[PDB]
From a paper:
Addressing the elusive specificity of cysteine cathepsins, which in contrast to caspases and trypsin-like proteases lack strict specificity determining P1 pocket, calls for innovative approaches. As a working model, cathepsin V was chosen because of the resolution of diffracting crystals (up to 1.3 Å) and crystal packing with accessible active site cleft. Reactive site mutants C25A and C25S of cathepsin V were used in structural studies.
In molecule B the electron density maps enabled the unambiguous interpretation of two further residues, P5′ and P6′, of the peptides AVAEKQ and RLSAKP. The second exception was the peptide AVAEKQ, which formed an internal H-bond between the O of the P3′ residue and the amino group of P6′, instead of to the side chain amide group of Q21. It also formed additional interactions with neighboring molecules in the crystal. On the non-primed side, the MPD molecule occupied the S2 site, and the CL- anion occupied the same position as the carbonyl oxygens of P1 residues in pattern groups I and II.
Author numbering:
A (entry chain PA): 444 to 448
B (entry chain AA): 1 to 222
């Protein structure tokens, strides 16, 4: 998962 | 007879926290973290490894770069390739690029990998105690995880089966005097040191495989 921007 | 707590960061096995930015490459950071600890255990030298080398070059083994991948397929790539470059020589740019692996810059090798018994937190605890940092998958698909700040993370919406994020278990612990009180896994993330607790998170331990931490764990054999 990616960090939310 | 395993220790009541473990922390490989305190023995020199773990590099500073990295940041995958906007690329689906958490699997590559979990895999370099595990190989970094095994190479340190083997040579006494801590060398940051290249996630971009894995993103760009391990599609033959089944990984998909910034679209996703698996730590076991990364350790399979390192074995078949004969090496992995340092972070310094093959820098991270958070996008899929042409494979530029250079053998002369390789600083790590593996002979294969070990799978921890699926679903078994006691097998994971034994691997963490006896081997070093261990690559694991988890369900990080929650606002509570994005804004985690401190303490033992426990999220009821967590799945133990449908996982979406690769991280590194660098230890385990408890609070107070009783080793069974408030147990947790010490987990290194790859969202920068600014996320969470200096880049780490404590996940509830021995609470029915919370968030899937022991569902798909592995480590490279060096
Ligand atoms: Cl990812
Ligand atoms: Cl995997």
């Amino acid at each position: 998962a990616v960090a939310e921007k | 007879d395993l220790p009541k707590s473990v922390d490989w960061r305190k023995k020199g096995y773990v590099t500073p926290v990295k940041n995958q930015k906007q690329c689906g490459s958490s699997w590559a950071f979990s895999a370099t973290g595990a190989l970094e600890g095994q190479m340190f255990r083997k040579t006494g030298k801590l060398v940051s490894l290249s996630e971009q080398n894995l993103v760009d070059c391990s599609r033959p083994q089944g990984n998909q770069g910034c679209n996703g991948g698996f730590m076991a397929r990364a350790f399979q790539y390192v074995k078949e390739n004969g090496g992995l470059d340092s972070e310094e020589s093959y820098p991270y740019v958070a996008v899929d690029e042409i494979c530029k692996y250079r053998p002369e810059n390789s600083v790590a090798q593996d002979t294969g990998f070990t799978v921890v018994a699926p679903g078994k937190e006691k097998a994971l605890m034994k691997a963490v105690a006896t081997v070093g940092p261990i690559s694991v998958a988890m369900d990080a698909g929650h606002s509570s995880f994005q804004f985690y700040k401190s303490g033992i993370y426990f999220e009821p919406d967590c799945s133990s089966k449908n996982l979406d994020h690769g991280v590194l278990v660098v230890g385990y612990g408890f609070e107070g005097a009783n080793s069974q009180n408030s147990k947790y896994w010490l987990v290194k993330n790859s969202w920068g040191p600014e996320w969470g607790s200096n880049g780490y998170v404590k996940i509830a331990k021995d609470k029915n495989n919370h968030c899937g931490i022991a569902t798909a764990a592995s480590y490279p054999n060096v």
